[PDB]
Amino acid sequence: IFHALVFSYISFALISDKRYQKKEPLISSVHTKVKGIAEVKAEILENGMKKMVSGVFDTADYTFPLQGNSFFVMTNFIKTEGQQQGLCPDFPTARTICSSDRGCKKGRMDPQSKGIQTGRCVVYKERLKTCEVSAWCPIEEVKDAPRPALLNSAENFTVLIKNNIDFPGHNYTTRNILPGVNITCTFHKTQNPQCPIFRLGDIFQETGDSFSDVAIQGGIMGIEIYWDCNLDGWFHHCRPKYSFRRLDDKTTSESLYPGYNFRYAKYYKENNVEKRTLIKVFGIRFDILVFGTGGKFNVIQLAVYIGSVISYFGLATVFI
Amino acid sequence: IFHALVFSYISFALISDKRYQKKEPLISSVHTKVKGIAEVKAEILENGMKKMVSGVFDTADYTFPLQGNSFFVMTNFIKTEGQQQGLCPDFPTARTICSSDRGCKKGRMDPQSKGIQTGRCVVYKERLKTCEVSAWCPIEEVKDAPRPALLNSAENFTVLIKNNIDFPGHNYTTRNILPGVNITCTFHKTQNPQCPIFRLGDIFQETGDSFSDVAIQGGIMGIEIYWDCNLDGWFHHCRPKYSFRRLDDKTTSESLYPGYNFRYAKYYKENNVEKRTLIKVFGIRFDILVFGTGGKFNVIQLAVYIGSVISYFGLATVFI
Amino acid sequence: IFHALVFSYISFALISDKRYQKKEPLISSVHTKVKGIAEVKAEILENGMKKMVSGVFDTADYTFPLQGNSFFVMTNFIKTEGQQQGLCPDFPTARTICSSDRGCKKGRMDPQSKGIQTGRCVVYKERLKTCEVSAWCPIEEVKDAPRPALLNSAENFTVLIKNNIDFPGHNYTTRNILPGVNITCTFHKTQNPQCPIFRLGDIFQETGDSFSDVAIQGGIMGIEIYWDCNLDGWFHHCRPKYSFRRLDDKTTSESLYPGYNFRYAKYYKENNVEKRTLIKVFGIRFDILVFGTGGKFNVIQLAVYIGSVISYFGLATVFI
Ligand SMILES: *[C@@H]1O[C@H](CO)[C@@H](O[C@@H]2O[C@H](CO)[C@@H](O)[C@H](O)[C@H]2NC(C)=O)[C@H](O)[C@H]1NC(C)=O
Ligand SMILES: *[C@@H]1O[C@H](CO)[C@@H](O[C@@H]2O[C@H](CO)[C@@H](O)[C@H](O)[C@H]2NC(C)=O)[C@H](O)[C@H]1NC(C)=O
Ligand SMILES: *[C@@H]1O[C@H](CO)[C@@H](O[C@@H]2O[C@H](CO)[C@@H](O)[C@H](O)[C@H]2NC(C)=O)[C@H](O)[C@H]1NC(C)=O
Ligand SMILES: C[C@@H](N/C(=N/c1cccc2ncccc12)NC#N)c1ccccc1
Ligand SMILES: C[C@@H](N/C(=N/c1cccc2ncccc12)NC#N)c1ccccc1
Ligand SMILES: C[C@@H](N/C(=N/c1cccc2ncccc12)NC#N)c1ccccc1
Ligand SMILES: *[C@@H]1O[C@H](CO)[C@@H](O)[C@H](O)[C@H]1NC(C)=O
Ligand SMILES: *[C@@H]1O[C@H](CO)[C@@H](O)[C@H](O)[C@H]1NC(C)=O
Ligand SMILES: *[C@@H]1O[C@H](CO)[C@@H](O)[C@H](O)[C@H]1NC(C)=O
Ligand SMILES: *[C@@H]1O[C@H](CO)[C@@H](O)[C@H](O)[C@H]1NC(C)=O
Ligand SMILES: *[C@@H]1O[C@H](CO)[C@@H](O)[C@H](O)[C@H]1NC(C)=O
Ligand SMILES: *[C@@H]1O[C@H](CO)[C@@H](O)[C@H](O)[C@H]1NC(C)=O
Structure with missing residues (x-):
């Protein structure tokens, strides 16, 4: 009685934990395209003198192509010109x-x-x-940094993420976007959870952190893509799960270099003198983290589970 | 009779699946050096006026060092000069x-x-x-993009890949290139499968995609390095397997931003005016994907396999 | 007698190998800030003529932000100006x-x-x-390359590494730096093994390679961060272990492109002529490699170990 129940429970532990299957780590490659522009009219104090910062900022002005599964979007800046x-x-x-x-x-x-x-x-x-x-x-x-981020409009920018994944051992490849899908969409936690188009302000709302505050001094946000993938035939599912997590520590301590910012140099020559323009760049780096496990029925795994289960069978019979 | 055969078969499942061994994920670092140049004589229409694009393009003109286990090679471009x-x-x-x-x-x-x-x-x-x-x-x-890719010669370029891998748990390190090897070689699927020197056109022939077509509008190709590594002594093998897979989706839809291309900006000053040159860059990004598993005989693993096997022993004896 | 001892030994193999726990791969994101400057007074021969290279090099002059869990620091350079x-x-x-x-x-x-x-x-x-x-x-x-590296002071530079790690399955996140720690410290193998602040010369001393020699022609060094993480309550420990390993092959062969160096181009216009300055850059790339395993007691795993152990129980009883 109790023994057939121990068997049905152990079989439940088999089906639920999917141990008849073999698990294989995922292989991921990422490609992002950022769309959006920002107009900048502001007043910044340089050396105790008020100045007017006015300019239109497009893609080439505030970002560059992703490297290492991460892309950056500038949101604020302090420009020091004429260094020699x-x-x-x-x-x-x-x-x-x-x-x-x-x-x-x-x-x-x-x-x-x-x-x-x-x-x-x-x-x-x-x-x-x-x-x-x-x-x-x-x-x-x-x-x-300027009290309002010069590129405050950055939260309205749109990032498009295309993710390709492969399992070599099972020889199975799939991409983030299925063919024929309605690409014109904005990702929502419930309305469009498969839509790859993200809005940065939406991302910051999901993690609960105000975009502007992070945009003043920069930060490191993280886009997570989960892949629970089942390869059997009796049941099948291999699609991504988008979550968002704020990666930066939020220390706010002058000793620990808070936020995300770096020193970008633009060299030129003027009046036969070697000169440099140092731009302190503040922005949010987005790290795209892809992690997945692919299961497919392995006869040796199921036989090993059976081997651990029949011992609990005999020994279970001894325990009664 | 049938039971000693079940034992020999389960032992075969041991030796084949190498469960006496322990599996450890690989650690990889990559270094690539691209060699080759391209001469560009072509005719491009700017604002309805025919123009002659002529220039010699070396390494610094079409690539920059790899970051995040991936390198890029420009193959086509559209240059818009004088933006203010x-x-x-x-x-x-x-x-x-x-x-x-x-x-x-x-x-x-x-x-x-x-x-x-x-x-x-x-x-x-x-x-x-x-x-x-x-x-x-x-x-x-x-x-x-120009109908013939301005950097059509890109398929003749040569990428040299040096890969270092380490297993910390087993404390074993090895590199892609063994010391004393004849480096002067071009990788072939059969003639030189260990040769690290790759030609891009060869890569595109292996995956079956014409280089020129991808080079017109860019793409994302992927170089895969497998490491099946055995650490026992009774048998040993720990060398890479080079495969090639085309990563980009090949949508060819104006809504999904097809190919690989980005907007690169070159800022300057002219006649006391802030100016910019926007270059739309088309090229093939190569992602180097390294994945490996290192096995080395673990006594606890072999004892656990034995533990799953002797239960199939006794229970197998009950089944007859 | 010997059987209760086999049981206590197998239980030791349980507690030591932590098989009651479930192992989950780590997720890592890295952020580094490099501090330090170098003054350069040297004498370099250009086209058979002695010249004086004098300049002050700050962060923006010798590095740029990390991409793909790796950062670069230039240590030597050969500058060719005026190419057209x-x-x-x-x-x-x-x-x-x-x-x-x-x-x-x-x-x-x-x-x-x-x-x-x-x-x-x-x-x-x-x-x-x-x-x-x-x-x-x-x-x-x-x-x-110049016989003394122009940026010889590079060994005195300081890299600050902040590492965030997450385990999704266990839903547990932690960072490299614990809150409230005394950040003002220099990492030492024994004195400050948790201190994230590294000095490059210290790194090169740990791996045993002289900094200057590598700095003349560049190299690839690797910073390793281990995370042995235990999530139980009965015992707990989840902190990093810093090790250092020299990644480059040290071939010293003109055919294999030894060291780390690349060709960086700075385009400009002079006398209504398109011109270029080609800088051959020599420096040490630091790859930050993070690898971790997170264990947390899984009932199914402990039951499977028990299942492999009770078969060794009965069969062990048959062996005597
Ligand atoms: C992002 O865009 C939205 C809408 O395009 C902005 O919200 C609008 O702002 C304008 C003036 O800037 C108002 O006239 C509208 O009434 C607003 N509409 C809504 C729905 O809010 C928003 O300000 C932009 N975000 C940033 C940071 O500039
Ligand atoms: C890559 O290089 C090969 C050989 O260097 C090119 O093929 C040759 O092209 C020249 C003229 O361009 C001909 O005179 C030769 O007869 C060709 N030889 C062979 C074996 O094809 C090839 O055109 C180059 N590829 C590109 C895209 O330019
Ligand atoms: C790194 O810095 C140390 C100390 O700041 C340098 O060592 C000193 O060098 C100065 C002259 O350069 C001497 O007057 C001091 O006596 C030295 N002190 C010690 C403790 O060595 C060191 O030379 C610097 N490294 C490099 C490569 O320049
Ligand atoms: C390519 C560069 N963008 C730049 N964008 C500006 C364009 C006009 C005026 C600016 N003023 C201040 C600051 C920036 C700009 N300028 C430069 N160099 C960049 C982009 C993203 C991250 C770092 C660096
Ligand atoms: C460094 C830059 N290469 C550039 N190469 C050119 C050299 C001469 C003429 C060109 N004309 C059009 C387009 C390019 C060039 N020019 C710039 N900036 C680059 C390289 C690789 C990928 C992106 C960007
Ligand atoms: C941004 C660039 N740094 C540059 N630093 C110099 C500043 C003054 C004089 C120099 N002379 C020779 C060489 C360099 C310099 N110059 C440029 N371009 C860089 C930094 C790190 C790695 C690659 C490239
Ligand atoms: C993977 O499966 C496809 C499906 O037919 C096959 O064409 C391909 O050759 C397989 N790959 C390998 C490496 O066997
Ligand atoms: C995509 O969905 C929207 C609804 O949000 C709809 O208005 C639009 O027409 C759809 N596009 C296509 C091509 O069907
Ligand atoms: C790894 O093995 C080598 C071989 O002797 C040894 O020198 C080295 O110390 C080992 N590493 C560790 C961390 O024990
Ligand atoms: C490398 O192999 C080629 C054959 O393809 C041969 O011609 C060449 O001499 C070899 N190099 C050396 C150093 O032996
Ligand atoms: C992870 O645990 C924390 C602890 O309370 C909880 O707030 C959070 O919702 C958990 N995350 C998920 C995805 O369940
Ligand atoms: C940090 O430690 C040093 C000792 O090396 C000490 O001098 C310093 O005061 C400490 N900082 C703080 C804030 O306690």
């Missing part, structure tokens, strides 16, 4: 202010300084003095 | 043609338009009128 | 020297040549003659 190699006083900071030449030692390097000191204490503005350095001059300001 | 921020009529399309100002609404954005409308209907050429937009002017043409 | 499309004699090499026009065939391409020949034998310097080619002129020298 030379000597200049470092930007005023608690570390950089100097009372006299004794505070500056030639050759000193600081993790928060972009230049090597010359050992002299010189004026920056009025009577405030900082330590003179040798680097790209003038030094970029120690200034916060 | 301003107001211009959008390029004539079924969506962009306007009969009067009522058709243009200020601030409108279109997925196929690269600019924000100003709300005015202005002439583009002759009496044909399109909606005026605010963006990088003039707008790139809506034009097909 | 045209005809020039190829640089003197055993392959390129020509006695007369019969040695040059028009349209010939060489794996070590950057241009297509025109079929004429012309002088390069004095009476030495090479084959005239059509390419970016003049051709970059066939010259060794």
Whole structure:
């Protein structure tokens, strides 16, 4: 009585855990196309002077093709133009202010300084003095990102994701998009869960984080694609499950370099002088993470499960 | 009789499926060097005027170092020079043609338009009128890629692939290239299946897709490296198997952004005006996919297989 | 007697190999921030003339953001300025020297040549003659990298690594850095093995390879992050293990393209002529490899182990 029930329960553990099947890791390749533009009219303070930042930003202006299953979209920026190699006083900071030449030692390097000191204490503005350095001059300001993200419209951008997956051992290949589907759609958790077209603001709403806040100083968001794939015939299902998870740590600590931002350089020549424009770029990197398991009935696996089950059979008969 | 045969068959399932061994996922790192150049003499129509595109393209002109186990080779391009921020009529399309100002609404954005409308209907050429937009002017043409790919010689290029793999649990490391091998070789399915030097046209012949067709509008090809690795001593083999699979979907639908292409921007300054050159790049991205399993005799695994087998022993004795 | 001992030993194989638990592959995302600068005063020979290379190199000058779980740091460079499309004699090499026009065939391409020949034998310097080619002129020298790496200070640079990992099946996420930790630290094998801050020279000392030697011609180093993660409650541990392994092959053979180096192009316009500056970049690419296994008690797994163990029970009783 109880033994045929132990057998039916163990068989349930077979069918549910799909141990008659063999599991094979998935192979994924990703291709994304970003669509959308943003118009930028804003007022940014450079060196204590108000300035008007106005420009139209298209695809080539705020992104470049994905590498390593991840793409980036710039949302804010601080542009420092005209840097040329030379000597200049470092930007005023608690570390950089100097009372006299004794505070500056030639050759000193600081993790928060972009230049090597010359050992002299010189004026920056009025009577405030900082330590003179040798680097790209003038030094970029120690200034916060614009309070509204210059590319605030970034949440309205649209990312199109095409994912190809293969299982070599089972020799089975399929793609994220099935042929003949109505591509004109915006992904929704319930209305269009197979629609590959994503809107960034929708993504940030799913994970619960406000897009604008992350867009001011950048972040790392993650798009997850699950593939529970069954290859039997008696039952079949091998389609993706889109989830969204915010990857960045959200420390908000000046020591841990919070948000996502980097220093992009644009070199040129002017008046027979080598010059550089340093752009501090703030944006959200999207990591596309694909993980899948493919099961297909293996005779050896089913026989091994049977082998672990008939021992519980005999021993179960001994236990009663 | 039949029972010793069931034992020999189960032992065959052991030796064949290598269950006395433990399986460990592979760790891969890739390094590719692309060699080859292409001379380009062609005739391309810009704004209804015939032009001569002539130039020599070396490594730095059509590729950049691999990131994320994938490298790209440009094969075709459409170059739009002199773009500067301003107001211009959008390029004539079924969506962009306007009969009067009522058709243009200020601030409108279109997925196929690269600019924000100003709300005015202005002439583009002759009496044909399109909606005026605010963006990088003039707008790139809506034009097909050159009928012969400008970099048609791309199939003759040579990619050299060096792959390092490690198994941490077994502490075993090996590389794609064994020391002392004759590197001067071109990979062939039978003549040189271990030769790492690949020719792109050969790759496209293996997968059966014509190189030129894909090169006109770009594509995503995939190089697969298999590692069936055995670590025992009684038998040993741990070398790669090169296969080739075309990753792109080949939709050929204007709604799904077919082929592989992106918008690359080159910013400069001219006559004290901020200017931009937009190059639409068409090329084949090669994804190097490495997947391997490393087996090495584990006593616990063999004992567990024995444990599943002796139950089939006793129960098998009961079945007769 | 011996049978209860076989049971205690098999139970030891259970607890040690953690087969009551289920193993799940790890999901990793990486974010690195490189800090440090380098001052460069050196003397490099261009075209047989001594020159002084002097410049200050910050983050934007020697690196760009990581893609595909790997970042690059330039350590040496050879800069060829002023290239424009045209005809020039190829640089003197055993392959390129020509006695007369019969040695040059028009349209010939060489794996070590950057241009297509025109079929004429012309002088390069004095009476030495090479084959005239059509390419970016003049051709970059066939010259060794500077004997001291121009960016020798690269070993003093600091890489900060933040790693996020997730197990979907168990729904458990954790990050490389625990909240509240003293970030100001330099990683040491024993003193600070959890400290994420790495120094490149320390990395190269751990693997035993001198930083400078690799920095002259570039290399591929690999940072490994292990995650042995236990999710039970009766015992718990899920933290990373940092190891370092040198990925490049160290062939030192001119045929196999040794070290890590690539050709980076900077296009500009001068005197109404399209021009290019070709920089041969030498540096160390760091591949961040994250691999982890997450175990959590699965009832079906423990029951399957029991099923393989009770058969060894009965059969063991038969063996005595
Ligand atoms: C994203 O786009 C939507 C709609 O295109 C913007 O919302 C509209 O904003 C305009 C003015 O900017 C208003 O006149 C409309 O009434 C708004 N409609 C809705 C439904 O909100 C939205 O502001 C855009 N997002 C960002 C960040 O700019
Ligand atoms: C790839 O290279 C081969 C040989 O270098 C090219 O084939 C030759 O083309 C030339 C003229 O271009 C002919 O004179 C030869 O007779 C051809 N030989 C062979 C064996 O085909 C081939 O055209 C190149 N591929 C591309 C796309 O340019
Ligand atoms: C890395 O930095 C260290 C210390 O900042 C350098 O070592 C010092 O070098 C200076 C001169 O360059 C000497 O005056 C000091 O006595 C040295 N101190 C120590 C502890 O070595 C080191 O040279 C730098 N590495 C490179 C490659 O430049
Ligand atoms: C290619 C580059 N985009 C750039 N876009 C701008 C175009 C006009 C004005 C700008 N002003 C400030 C900042 C940017 C821009 N400029 C450069 N270089 C880029 C894109 C994405 C991520 C990093 C870098
Ligand atoms: C670095 C860049 N290559 C570029 N190569 C050209 C060199 C001369 C003329 C060209 N004309 C049209 C198009 C290209 C070129 N030009 C730029 N910028 C590149 C390479 C590979 C993939 C994307 C981009
Ligand atoms: C962005 C670029 N860095 C560049 N840094 C230099 C700055 C001043 C003088 C230089 N001279 C020689 C060589 C380099 C430089 N120059 C360019 N382009 C780069 C960075 C990292 C890896 C590849 C390329
Ligand atoms: C995979 O299956 C298809 C289906 O017919 C077959 O054409 C192909 O050759 C198979 N691949 C391999 C490597 O056997
Ligand atoms: C796609 O679906 C939308 C409904 O959201 C519909 O309006 C549209 O016509 C559909 N497209 C096609 C080609 O059927
Ligand atoms: C791996 O094996 C080699 C072979 O001797 C040994 O030198 C090395 O220390 C081993 N690695 C570890 C981490 O034990
Ligand atoms: C490599 O093999 C080729 C045969 O295809 C041969 O001509 C060449 O000499 C070999 N190289 C060496 C170094 O033996
Ligand atoms: C994962 O566990 C947390 C812990 O409460 C829970 O809030 C979350 O919803 C879980 N995720 C899923 C997908 O169930
Ligand atoms: C971090 O540790 C160092 C010791 O190496 C110590 O000097 C420093 O004060 C610590 N930082 C904090 C915030 O406690």
